[PDB]
Design a protein around this ligand. Structure first.
Ligand SMILES: *[C@@H](CS(C)(=O)=O)[C@H](Cc1ccc(CN)cc1)NC(=O)[C@H](CC(C)C)NC(=O)[C@H](CC(C)C)NC(=O)c1cnccn1
Ligand SMILES: [Cl-]
Ligand SMILES: [Mg+2]
Ligand SMILES: [Mg+2]
Lengths: 241, 250, 231, 204, 223, 244, 243, 196
C-alpha cells in the first residue's frame, strides 16, 4: 500500500496524500470566515493563545501579501508561512515584470498551480493548508479566492474554513438567501466587520473577547489587520444593539 | 532537497495493464459528464458546472477554455490537472507553432501536442498521469471542423460525437440515436442540451451549464478593424442568457 | 528495527540507529588514549595486527606542525577526516598567516560529520578521533564522535575496553594535569592509562604508538624502538 | 572579405496574371575566378519555390534545411506547405541566427494552391520580409535588377510575356555585374504546371 | 523611417510612413511599420527592421498568453515593461526604436522605447530619421484636448513632413486610432501622395526576343 | 528515501528475462492485430482498429498506419501514444540522414536506430519500456522491398510475412500455410484480409475497422508509391476479395 | 501503517510522524530556556557533566549570530550547530544587501523557513532540535522558540528539553508576578534559578550553568556571555533558592 | 542633466531639470528624473537613462519585497540596494544616482552614488553634467535646517544657473518634497526661473 504514501493514484482514482493534507488543515482547530462589502473585503479568524508564555502579538494566521492583497490560512503555521513567503515573492515579481499590481484571483491561481504540482510530482508533498486570498481588486472589486492542497481554487461571495465550516457556511448561505445579493450592503468596512463577527457568533454559538479574534480588512489600494483595540471597538458596537 | 524520483511511477503489471493509467481513467469516470457533438457548420462542447458550494461564484470556474481563437477544450475528471494542461496547451500553440509559421496550429496538431504532454506523464520519472480526459473541438482552414478526445494515456481519437465521465455510457447511446452527418450547429446544441439533462440531477439552466461552440468567424469579438484577412475567433462561449433561450425550445 | 535502514530516519523514541551503529564500529576498534597537561598533550594508541605476519595498523595521523589525531574504527574514514583537517589547518596558514585553533578544528569536524547524518544516500563516519594540539591558548584534547559531538577534555579513551583507561584518568586527573614541562612523565601516565584497557595482550615495541605536541614541541609520532623507552 | 559578394550571383522573382516567375544566374565564383557554370540558386519544396543568393555554402545549407523542415511539415500536416506559411518559416529560421546570420538573400515564389493567388517575397539575411506585389530582386547585381525591373515590369503579364520581361531583366543586369552571369535559368510557374528554361547569354 | 504618435481627447493615435531602405536603395514601398501587439495595443517600429518586427511579435505572443492566463485585457504598461526589459537585455544590439500606444482598463497611453531599453512618456513623440521633420510639425501645432479629426490630421501631417523632407522616409502614410470604449481602427495606406506617374513607353517585348537553350517540365506534384 | 517506490524497470528475473519487456509484450498481445506481407512487386500492411464505435470519425483517424518518409511506413500494435513518440524520432532520423548524405535512408538503418532507442529503455534510465511493436514496411535501392518488426526489447528481425498484436499464433500459422515466394501484391492484399478475417475477435470484419496500406514500385516510371487506403477504398477491396 | 517510516508523509490523521519523532530527540536533550526582559533577552542552558574529565567553561553551547542575536538549543547538538551556521549565512547576506543588521522577527523566519524545508522531502531528515533565540533590534527586544516542524512563536519566556514542564511552570510565575516587566540583571538571576529547578529531572548527574544576554542598557544591544562575578552572583542566587 | 537633493528642517527635497539629449538634439524636454522607489524614498537619476531606469525598477522591486516581509525600509537600506547594483555591475553601468528619503526617526537623509558605486551620505548633493557650474554657488548659499520655502528657493536658484550654462540641462525644474506631511510635487517653468 505505497499508493497512500506518495502522490499517485489508488485503484479508486484517489490521491490519499492530498486527502490527508486536507485533514492537516484542521489540525489548528481554528475557524476562518470571509465576506464582502461594497467597498471592502473582511476576513475574520479565531485566535487561540493556549499558552500564557506566548507573545500573543506574534500569533497570527493572517498575512499581508502585498499592499492590496491579504491572505488568511487554515492549517499548521510552518506551511502557512511557506505559502505566505512564496505568495509575497510572486506578488512582487509580478509587479516588476508586468508593471501593475498582481490581482487577488491571479495570485490564487498561481498558488493553486503550485499546489497542483505537489499532487502530480512525487518528491514534493502537498502543503497542509487552505489559503483564503482577499483584496479589493481594481478591475473586479471586492474579491475572495480560496486555494487548497488539491490545487483547486474558486472565487467566493463569502466563505468559511475550519472544523466547524459547515455551520458557518450554512449560516452565511441562509443570510444571502434572504438579502438576495452577493455581498453585505454596507458603506463602512467597520460595519462589515461587525457583521462578520456577529454571524460567526451565531454560527459557532460562542461569545468573543478582543483577544479571541483576528481581523483583516481589504479596501481600495490597501489591506490591513485590526489591532486588539480596533476589534474591541467592534465588539462594543455589536453588544450595544 | 533533491528530486530522487528519476524512475517511472507507471509500470506494466504482469497482466499487461498500466495500473496508473487505468486508475486515472477511473478518476475520469467519477468526474462530471461532459460531451462534444460535431455538426456540418460547427462543433459544440458542453458540461455541467457542478458547484462545490452555493457561496462559490461558478462563473469564475471556467471548465470550458479557449486554447486558440479557433480551438476550445472541455474536460471530465480532476479540474486542477485540466487547468495546468490548458496553460501548457496555450503556450505550446505559440512556441512550437505560431512563432515558427506565423499562424495558429490546426486542431489535430495542437491535440497531438497535448497528447504528447500527457503521454510524458505516463512514462517520465517521478510523476503520475494526468487524471483527466479532454474533449478538444476546433476548426482550421484545411481540415475544417473537428472534435478530438484525449485520454490519460496520451491516446487521442477523432469523434463525430461523444461523452466522457459520469454518465458517458448512457450519454453515448443517446448520441448514437440522435447524430447524423446533416446536423446544423443549432441542432447539435439542442441535442447537447438534451443529452446533458439526463446526467444532471439538480438545477438545469444557463448558470449550472457551461457550453461553447466552434462556429463562424466573429469579427465583432476581434477588437480591431483594418486587416481584411483576420476575421475573428471561431470559438465562442455561450452566455447564461443564450443557453436559457434554447432551453425554452427544448 | 524498521527505522535503521538509513541515516535519514528517526526511530519512534527519537534515535538515529545508523549513527548508533557507526558508534558501535568505534567500540570494536582498538583502544586509544588521549591526555594533556598545561604545556603538552599526548596521544597513546594500541595498534592492532591482522595476524603475526601482518603489520600493526597505524592509529595516529599528523594534521599540522601543532595538531594531530589518533583514530579508532574505520581507518579510511579517519583518513578522509584527517585530510579535511589538514586542508583547514593549511587554509588558515596560507590565507590568514594563522595557526588553526584546536577548538575551531573540532567545530569543523562536527559540522562535516553532521551533514552525513541528515542527508539521504550518505552514511555517518564510522570512526572516533582524539585530536590533540597546542595553539595560542595552550594545550588541548578533543574527542570526536561521528554523531557530530566533539568534546574538549583533560583526558579520555575510545575503542574496545576503553572504560578501564577512562576510569584511571578520572582518578589520576589531579596528578597528570600538573605534569608541566616534562614530556616523558606525561607519556608514562598515558602508557599507564592504556594499560588498564589491556587483557591477555601486553604493550610490545611494534604494538605501541605514541604522539606528543607542546610548547616548544612540534607534533611528532613515535613508533618502534622510539617507544621501547616507555614499555 | 564581404561574404554576400564572394561567390556572386542573382535571383529575381516576378508576378503576372495567374502565374509567378522566378529566375537566377548560374555562376559560382571565388571573387574574380569563375568556378562553376551549373550552380543553380532556385530550389522547390512541393509547389513553393525558393531562390537564394549570397554565400554559396549557406545557399546549399539552407536548401537542405528547408527540405528537412518542409518534409516534416508534410508528414505532420498531411499536406504540402503553402508560400505564405513558408515565407514565415524562412523568416523564423533566418532570425533565430540573428547574431550569426546566414549570408543570403532568399526569395520565395509560388501560387497558393487553395486561393490560386500568386505570391512572391524577399528577405534580408536576418529574415525581414519584403512581400512585394510587383517584383523581388536579390544578389550582387540587385541595383541593376532594381533598375531593369522598375522600368521593364508591368502588372498582369501573361506567362509567356512575363518570361520575356524577367529574362531581359536578369540578362541585362548580369551583363553589368562582373560576379553574375555564366548562364541563367527561368521558372514559369502556374497553378498546376511549371516550365523551366535555360537562357543563352554571353559567357564572360 | 518616420514614426509618430500623439494623444487626443479620449484616445491615442499612431502614424508611420511605408518606406523600408537598404543602404541608399528602396527595398519596400509599402511595408507596415505599425505592429499588432494586442487588439487595442499597437507599436510603431523604426531602426533595424527585422529587430523591430521580431521584438513586437514576441511581446505580442507573450501578451496574448498573459491575457489568457489572467483573463484580463492586456495593459500598455505590460507591453512597455516587457519590450524594455527585452531590449535592455540585448544592450541595443536589437536596434529597434518603438512608439507603443494603446487603450486598456487603466486608460489611454503613449510611450517611446529606444533600442538600449530607455522609455519616455509623452503626449506627442516621433522616432526614426524623419523624427525631426515630424517633431517640428508636432511642436508647431499640437495642443491639449484635440478632437479625433484634428489628431488624425496632425499625425498624418507629422508623418508627411518626414516623407517629403527626409530621404529615409517615403511613400504612403499608415495610421492607427485607438479610442476609449471603441474598437481600435487600423488605417493602412491612409494617405497615398506618392503614386508613380504613368510611364512614357511600354517595355513589353516581342515574344521570342530572349534566346533559350533548353526547356523542361518540372514535376512539382507528389508521386 | 525514494528507493522504496522504485519498480526497477531494467532488471533480469532469476530466469534471465526482462520483466517489463515481457509484461509489455503481454500488453501488445491484447492490441489490434497488424499484418505485414511482402511480395515481389510490393508490400502490404493491414491492421485491425480496436475501438469499434459508430461515432468514431474514421477518415481523419490514424491509430495503426503511419508514414515515416516517402519510402517507409509502419504498422503499430500497443500504446498509440508511445508509438507516436518513436515515430517522430524515426521521421527526424530519416531527415538527418537525408541532410547529411543527400540520399534517402536505407530501411534497416532507420529500423536499427529505433530498435536501439527501445533497447536503451530496457538497459538504463529506470523508465518503463515503450509498449509498442512495429511492423516496418519499406523500400530502398540496396535490398528493395523489406519487412521488419521491432518489439519493446529492441530486438528486430526481417520477414516475408508477419503479424503483431492479438492472435499472432493463429495468424502466423495461417500466413505460413498460404504464403509463397513468387506471390504478388494483389494476392498478398487478399491473404492479409483473409488472415485478419479468421483471427479477428469480432463477429465480422468490416471497412470501418481496418487501416490498410501498400508500398508499390508500380508508380509512374519506376518510382515507389505509398498508398494509405481511404475508408471507401478499404470497403472496395473487401468486396473485391469477397469478404463482405 | 508505514506512515512513520518516511519524512514528509502525512498519516491518515494529517500528521508527519517523523517530525513528532524528532521532537522525542528534543525532549531527550538537556534543559535550555529563554527569558524576555525590559530591554533585552536572557538565555540559559543546562550542560550535563558526564565526567570529571570535561573541562569547565569550555564546551560552550550558546552561539552568537551576527553580533546581536543569541541562539541556544536542546536535542541533537550538531543539528543545532548546522542551523546556527545557516542563520549566520542568512544574517550576513541580509546585512550585505540591506546594510542594517537583520531584525529578530526577520531572522526568526529565515530559520523557520529552513527548518520547514526539511519537512517537505523524504531525502532529508527533520531537525532534532528546538531552538530558543532572540536579541535586540531597532523595534526592541524579541524572544523566539523554534520547533522541528518549523513552527515558531514569539515568547515572554521559553523552555525546551527534559526539564521543560518544570521550567515552564517557573516562567509562568514570573509572567504573573511581574506584568510591568523584568530587568536584565533580574532575568539573569531568574534564569539561573530556573535551570537549577529544572535539574530535578536530570538529577543523576551534576551540571554546569551557562548564561548569555543581550540588553540595550547592559550590553549596548550586543550578545555577550555572562562571565565571572555576574555568573557567580546568579549561581549563588540559584543555590539559595533551591535550599 | 542637473539634479540635486537637499535636507532641511522638515525633511528633504529632490530637484531636477527635465531635459534629455541625444547629442545636441533634445529627445525629451519634459522628462521626469525624480523617481519613486518607495512611498517616501525617491531618487534623482543621471547618466544612461536605460541603466538608471533598469536599476531604479529593480530597487523598487527589492524594497516592495522588503516591505512585505520586514516593514518600511530605511533610506539607508534603499541607498545600499542602489549601491549594491551599481558597484557590482560597475563595468556595464553609467549611472549617477542621488537617493533621498524621509523616515520619522532619521528625518530627511540624502545619499549620493556616483559612477564608481561608492556611497556618500551628505546634507545636500548635486549631480549631472550641469552640476559642475553650481559647486561654487551651492557651497556659498547652502545652510543646514532651512525652511521649506528657503530650500525650494535654494534648489530653484541653483538649477536655474545649472540650466543657464549647461546645454545638456533645460526645460522645467521639477521638485519632490518629502516630509511627515507626505509627498508634494512642484514644477517651475522657464518664465519663472530664467529671470532670477
Ligand atoms: C526605417 C528605419 S530608419 C532608416 O532608422 O529611420 C525602417 C523601419 C522599418 C522598416 C520595415 C519594417 C517592416 N517590418 C519595420 C520597420 N528600417 C529600414 O528601412 C531598415 C534600415 C536599416 C536598418 C539601416 N532596413 C532594414 O532592416 C533592411 C531590411 C528591410 C529592407 C526589410 N536591412 C538592411 O538594411 C540591412 C543592411 N545590412 C545587413 C542587413 N540588413
Ligand atoms: Cl502557473
Ligand atoms: Mg558578366
Ligand atoms: Mg567572366
Amino acid at each position: 500500500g505505497y499508493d497512500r504514501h506518495i502522490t499517485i493514484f489508488s485503484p479508486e482514482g484517489r490521491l490519499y496524500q492530498v486527502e490527508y493534507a486536507f485533514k492537516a488543515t484542521n489540525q489548528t482547530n481554528i475557524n476562518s470566515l470571509a465576506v464582502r462589502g461594497k467597498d471592502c473585503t473582511v476576513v475574520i479568524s479565531q485566535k487561540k493563545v493556549p499558552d500564557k508564555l506566548l507573545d500573543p502579538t506574534t500569533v497570527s494566521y493572517i498575512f499581508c501579501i502585498s499592499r492590496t492583497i491579504g491572505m488568511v490560512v487554515n492549517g499548521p503555521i510552518p506551511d502557512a508561512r511557506n505559502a505566505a513567503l512564496r505568495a509575497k515573492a510572486e506578488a512582487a515579481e509580478f509587479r516588476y515584470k508586468y508593471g501593475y499590481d498582481m490581482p487577488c484571483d491571479v495570485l490564487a491561481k498561481r498558488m493553486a498551480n503550485l499546489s497542483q504540482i505537489y499532487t502530480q510530482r512525487a518528491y514534493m508533498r502537498p502543503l497542509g493548508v487552505i489559503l483564503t486570498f482577499v483584496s479589493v481588486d481594481e478591475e473586479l472589486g471586492p474579491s475572495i479566492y480560496k486555494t487548497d492542497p488539491a490545487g483547486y481554487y474558486v472565487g467566493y461571495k463569502a466563505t468559511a474554513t475550519g472544523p466547524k465550516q459547515q455551520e458557518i457556511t450554512t449560516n452565511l448561505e441562509n443570510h444571502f438567501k434572504k438579502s438576495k445579493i452577493d455581498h453585505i450592503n454596507e458603506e463602512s468596512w467597520e460595519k462589515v466587520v461587525e457583521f462578520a463577527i456577529t454571524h460567526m457568533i451565531d454560527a459557532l454559538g460562542t461569545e468573543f473577547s478582543k483577544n479571541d479574534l483576528e481581523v483583516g480588512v481589504a479596501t481600495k489600494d490597501k489591506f490591513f489587520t485590526l489591532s486588539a483595540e480596533n476589534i474591541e471597538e467592534r465588539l462594543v458596537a455589536i453588544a450595544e444593539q | 532537497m533533491t528530486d530522487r524520483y528519476s524512475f517511472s511511477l507507471t509500470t506494466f503489471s504482469p497482466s499487461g495493464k498500466l495500473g496508473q493509467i487505468d486508475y486515472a481513467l477511473t478518476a475520469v469516470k467519477q468526474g462530471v459528464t461532459s460531451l462534444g457533438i460535431k455538426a456540418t457548420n460547427g462543433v459544440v462542447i458542453a458540461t455541467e458546472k457542478k458547484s462545490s458550494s452555493p457561496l462559490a461564484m461558478s462563473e469564475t470556474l471556467s471548465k470550458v477554455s479557449l486554447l486558440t481563437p479557433d480551438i476550445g477544450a472541455v474536460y471530465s475528471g480532476m479540474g486542477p490537472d485540466y487547468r495546468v494542461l490548458v496553460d501548457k496547451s496555450r503556450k505550446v500553440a505559440h512556441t512550437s507553432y505560431k512563432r515558427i509559421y506565423g499562424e495558429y496550429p490546426p486542431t489535430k496538431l495542437l491535440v497531438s501536442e497535448v497528447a504528447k504532454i500527457m503521454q510524458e506523464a505516463t512514462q517520465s520519472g517521478g510523476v503520475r498521469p494526468f487524471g483527466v480526459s479532454l474533449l478538444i473541438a476546433g476548426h482550421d482552414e484545411f481540415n475544417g471542423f473537428s472534435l478530438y478526445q484525449v485520454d490519460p494515456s496520451g491516446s487521442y481519437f477523432p469523434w463525430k460525437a461523444t461523452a466522457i465521465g459520469k454518465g458517458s455510457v448512457a450519454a453515448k447511446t443517446f448520441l448514437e440515436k440522435r447524430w447524423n452527418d446533416e446536423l446544423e450547429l443549432e441542432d447539435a446544441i439542442h441535442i447537447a442540451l438534451l443529452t446533458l439533462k439526463e446526467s444532471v440531477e439538480g438545477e438545469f439552466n444557463g448558470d449550472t451549464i457551461e457550453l461553447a461552440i466552434i462556429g463562424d468567424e466573429n469579427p465583432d469579438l476581434l477588437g480591431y478593424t483594418g486587416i481584411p484577412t483576420d476575421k475573428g475567433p471561431r470559438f465562442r462561449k455561450l452566455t447564461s442568457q443564450e443557453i436559457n433561450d434554447r432551453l425554452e425550445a427544448l | 528495527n524498521n527505522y535503521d535502514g538509513d541515516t535519514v530516519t528517526f526511530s519512534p523514541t527519537g534515535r538515529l540507529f545508523q549513527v548508533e551503529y557507526a558508534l558501535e564500529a568505534i567500540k570494536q576498534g582498538s583502544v586509544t588514549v588521549g591526555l594533556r597537561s598545561n604545556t603538552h598533550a599526548v596521544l597513546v594508541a594500541l595498534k592492532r595486527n591482522a595476524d603475526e605476519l601482518s603489520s600493526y595498523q597505524k592509529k595516529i595521523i599528523k594534521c599540522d606542525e601543532h595538531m594531530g589525531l589518533s583514530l579508532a574504527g574505520l581507518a579510511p574514514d579517519a583518513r578522509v577526516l584527517s585530510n579535511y583537517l589538514r586542508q583547514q589547518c593549511n587554509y588558515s596558514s596560507l590565507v590568514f598567516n594563522r595557526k588553526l585553533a584546536v577548538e575551531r578544528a573540532g567545530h569543523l569536524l562536527c559540522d562535516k560529520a553532521q551533514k552525513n547524518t541528515q542527508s539521504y544516500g550518505g552514511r555517518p563516519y564510522g570512526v572516533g578521533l582524539l585530536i590533540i594540539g597546542y595553539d595560542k591558548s595552550g594545550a588541548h584534547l578533543l574527542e570526536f564522535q561521528p554523531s557530530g559531538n566533539v568534546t574538549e577534555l583533560y583526558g579520555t579513551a575510545i575503542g574496545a575496553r576503553s572504560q578501564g583507561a577512562k576510569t584511571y584518568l578520572e582518578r589520576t586527573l589531579d596528578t597528570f594535569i600538573k605534569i608541566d614541562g616534562n614530556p616523558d612523565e606525561l607519556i608514562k601516565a598515558g602508557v599507564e592509562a592504556i594499560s588498564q584497557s589491556l587483557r591477555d595482550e601486553s604493550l610490545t615495541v611494534d604494538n605501541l604508538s605514541i604522539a606528543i605536541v607542546g610548547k616548544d614541541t612540534p607534533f611528532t609520532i613515535y613508533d618502534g624502538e622510539a617507544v621501547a623507552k616507555y614499555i | 572579405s564581404d561574404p554576400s559578394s564572394i561567390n556572386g550571383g542573382i535571383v529575381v522573382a516576378m508576378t503576372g496574371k495567374d502565374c509567378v516567375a522566378i529566375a537566377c544566374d548560374l555562376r559560382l565564383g571565388s571573387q574574380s575566378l569563375g568556378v562553376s557554370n551549373k550552380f543553380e540558386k532556385i530550389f522547390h519544396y512541393g509547389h513553393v519555390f525558393l531562390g537564394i543568393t549570397g554565400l554559396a555554402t549557406d545557399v546549399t545549407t539552407l536548401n537542405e534545411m528547408f527540405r528537412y523542415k518542409t518534409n516534416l511539415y508534410k508528414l505532420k500536416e498531411e499536406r504540402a506547405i503553402e508560400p505564405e506559411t513558408f515565407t514565415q518559416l524562412v523568416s523564423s529560421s533566418l532570425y533565430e541566427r540573428r547574431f550569426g546570420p546566414y549570408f543570403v538573400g532568399p526569395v520565395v515564389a509560388g501560387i497558393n494552391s487553395k486561393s490560386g493567388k500568386p505570391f512572391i517575397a524577399g528577405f534580408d539575411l536576418i529574415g525581414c520580409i519584403d512581400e512585394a506585389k510587383d517584383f523581388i530582386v536579390s544578389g550582387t547585381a540587385s541595383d541593376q535588377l532594381f533598375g531593369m525591373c522598375e522600368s521593364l515590369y508591368e502588372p498582369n503579364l501573361e506567362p509567356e510575356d512575363l518570361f520575356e520581361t524577367i529574362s531581359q531583366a536578369l540578362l541585362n543586369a548580369a551583363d553589368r555585374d562582373a560576379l553574375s552571369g555564366w548562364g541563367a535559368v527561368v521558372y514559369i510557374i502556374k497553378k498546376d504546371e511549371v516550365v523551366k528554361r535555360y537562357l543563352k547569354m554571353r559567357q564572360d | 523611417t518616420t514614426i509618430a504618435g500623439l494623444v487626443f481627447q479620449d484616445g491615442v493615435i499612431l502614424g508611420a510612413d511605408t518606406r523600408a531602405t537598404n543602404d541608399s536603395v528602396v527595398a519596400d514601398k509599402s511595408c507596415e511599420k505599425i505592429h499588432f501587439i494586442a487588439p487595442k495595443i499597437y507599436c510603431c517600429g523604426a531602426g533595424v527592421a527585422a529587430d523591430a518586427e521580431a521584438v513586437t511579435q514576441l511581446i505580442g505572443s507573450n501578451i496574448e498568453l498573459h491575457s489568457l492566463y489572467t483573463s484580463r485585457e492586456p495593459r500598455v504598461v505590460s507591453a512597455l515593461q516587457m519590450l524594455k526589459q527585452h531590449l535592455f537585455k540585448y544592450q541595443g544590439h536589437i536596434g529597434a526604436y518603438l512608439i507603443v500606444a494603446g487603450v486598456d482598463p487603466t486608460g489611454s497611453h503613449l510611450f517611446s522605447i529606444h533600442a538600449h531599453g530607455s522609455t519616455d512618456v509623452g503626449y506627442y513623440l516621433s522616432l526614426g530619421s524623419g523624427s525631426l521633420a515630424a517633431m517640428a510639425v508636432l511642436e508647431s501645432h499640437w495642443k491639449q484636448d484635440l478632437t479625433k479629426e484634428e489628431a488624425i490630421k496632425l499625425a498624418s501631417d507629422a508623418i508627411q513632413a518626414g516623407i517629403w523632407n527626409d530621404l529615409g522616409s517615403g511613400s504612403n502614410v499608415d495610421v492607427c486610432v485607438m479610442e476609449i470604449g471603441k474598437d481600435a481602427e487600423y488605417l493602412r495606406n491612409y494617405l497615398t501622395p506618392n503614386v508613380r506617374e504613368e510611364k512614357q513607353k511600354s517595355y513589353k517585348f516581342p515574344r521570342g526576343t530572349t534566346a533559350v537553350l533548353k526547356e523542361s517540365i518540372v514535376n512539382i506534384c507528389d508521386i | 528515501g525514494s528507493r522504496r517506490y522504485d519498480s526497477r524497470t531494467t532488471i533480469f528475473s532469476p530466469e534471465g528475462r526482462l520483466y517489463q519487456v515481457e509484461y509489455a509484450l503481454e500488453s501488445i498481445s491484447h492490441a489490434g492485430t497488424a499484418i505485414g506481407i511482402m511480395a515481389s512487386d510490393g508490400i502490404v500492411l493491414a491492421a485491425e482498429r480496436k475501438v469499434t464505435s459508430t461515432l468514431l470519425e474514421q477518415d481523419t483517424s490514424t491509430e495503426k498506419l503511419y508514414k515515416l518518409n516517402d519510402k517507409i511506413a509502419v504498422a503499430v500494435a500497443g500504446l498509440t501514444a508511445d508509438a507516436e513518440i518513436l515515430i517522430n524520432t524515426a521521421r527526424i532520423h530519416a531527415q538527418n540522414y537525408l541532410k547529411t548524405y543527400n540520399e534517402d535512408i536505407p530501411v534497416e538503418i532507420l529500423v536499427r536506430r529505433l530498435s536501439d532507442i527501445k533497447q536503451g529503455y530496457t538497459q538504463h534510465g529506470g523508465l518503463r519500456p515503450f509498449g509498442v511493436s512495429f511492423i516496418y514496411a519499406g523500400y530502398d535501392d540496396r535490398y528493395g522491398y523489406q519487412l521488419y518488426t521491432s518489439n519493446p526489447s529492441g530486438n528486430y528481425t526481417g520477414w516475408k510475412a508477419i503479424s503483431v498484436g492479438a492472435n499472432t499464433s493463429a495468424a502466423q500459422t495461417l500466413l505460413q500455410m498460404d504464403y509463397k515466394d513468387d506471390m504478388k501484391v494483389d494476392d498478398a492484399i487478399e491473404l492479409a484480409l483473409k488472415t485478419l478475417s479468421k483471427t479477428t475477435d469480432s463477429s465480422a470484419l468490416t471497412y470501418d475497422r481496418l487501416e490498410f496500406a501498400t508500398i508499390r514500385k508500380g508508380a509512374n516510371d519506376g518510382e515507389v508509391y505509398q498508398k494509405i487506403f481511404k475508408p471507401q477504398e478499404i470497403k472496395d477491396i473487401l468486396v473485391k476479395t469477397g469478404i463482405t | 501503517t508505514g506512515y512513520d517510516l518516511s519524512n514528509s508523509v502525512f498519516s491518515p490523521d494529517g500528521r508527519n510522524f517523523q517530525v513528532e519523532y524528532a521532537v522525542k530527540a528534543v525532549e531527550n536533550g538537556t534543559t535550555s530556556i529563554g527569558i524576555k526582559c525590559n530591554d533585552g533577552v536572557v538565555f540559559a542552558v543546562e550542560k550535563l557533566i558526564t565526567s570529571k574529565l570535561l573541562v569547565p567553561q569550555k564546551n560552550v553551547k550558546i552561539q552568537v549570530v551576527d553580533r546581536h542575536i543569541g541562539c541556544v538549543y536542546s536535542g541533537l547538538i550538531p543539528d543545532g550547530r548546522h542551523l546556527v551556521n545557516r542563520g549566520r549565512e542568512e544574517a550576513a547576506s541580509f546585512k550585505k544587501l540591506y546594510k542594517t543588521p537583520i531584525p529578530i522577527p526577520a531572522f526568526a523566519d529565515r530559520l523557520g523557513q529552513y527548518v520547514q524545508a526539511h519537512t517537505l522531502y523524504n531525502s532529508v531528515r527533520p531537525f532534532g532540535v528546538s531552538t530558543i533565540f532572540g536579541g535586540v533590534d531597532k523595534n526592541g527586544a524579541h524572544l523566539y522558540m523554534l520547533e522541528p516542524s518549523g513552527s515558531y512563536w514569539g515568547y515572554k519566556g521559553a523552555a525546551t528539553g527534559k526539564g521543560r514542564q518544570s521550567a515552564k511552570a517557573e516562567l509562568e510565575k514570573l509572567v504573573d508576578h511581574h506584568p510591568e516587566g523584568l530587568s536584565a540583571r533580574e532575568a539573569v538571576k531568574q534564569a539561573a534559578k530556573i535551570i537549577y529547578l529544572a535539574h530535578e529531572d536530570n538529577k543523576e548527574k551534576d551540571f554546569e550553568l551557562e548564561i548569555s544576554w543581550c540588553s540595550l542598557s547592559e550590553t549596548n544591544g550586543l550578545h555577550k556571555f555572562v562571565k565571572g562575578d555576574l555568573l557567580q552572583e546568579a549561581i549563588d542566587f540559584a543555590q539559595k533558592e533551591i535550599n | 542633466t542637473s539634479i540635486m537633493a537637499v535636507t532641511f528642517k522638515d525633511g528633504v527635497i529632490l530637484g531636477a531639470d527635465s531635459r534629455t539629449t541625444t547629442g545636441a538634439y533634445i529627445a525629451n524636454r519634459v522628462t521626469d528624473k525624480l523617481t519613486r522607489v518607495h512611498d517616501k524614498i525617491w531618487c534623482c537619476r543621471s547618466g544612461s537613462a536605460a541603466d538608471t531606469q533598469a536599476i531604479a525598477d529593480i530597487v523598487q522591486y527589492h524594497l516592495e519585497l522588503y516591505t512585505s516581509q520586514y516593514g518600511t525600509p530605511s533610506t539607508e537600506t534603499a541607498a545600499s540596494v542602489f549601491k549594491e547594483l551599481c558597484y557590482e555591475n560597475k563595468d556595464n553601468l553609467t549611472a549617477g544616482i542621488i537617493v533621498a528619503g524621509y523616515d520619522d526617526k532619521n528625518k530627511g537623509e540624502v545619499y549620493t552614488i556616483p559612477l564608481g558605486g561608492s556611497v556618500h551620505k551628505l546634507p545636500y548633493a548635486i549631480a549631472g553634467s550641469g552640476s559642475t557650474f553650481i559647486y561654487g554657488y551651492c557651497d556659498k548659499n547652502f545652510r543646514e535646517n532651512m525652511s521649506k520655502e528657503e530650500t525650494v528657493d535654494f534648489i530653484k536658484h541653483s538649477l536655474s544657473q545649472a540650466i543657464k550654462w549647461d546645454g545638456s540641462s533645460g526645460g522645467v525644474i521639477r521638485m519632490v518634497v518629502l516630509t511627515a506631511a507626505g509627498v508634494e510635487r512642484l514644477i517651475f517653468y522657464p518664465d519663472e526661473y530664467e529671470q532670477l
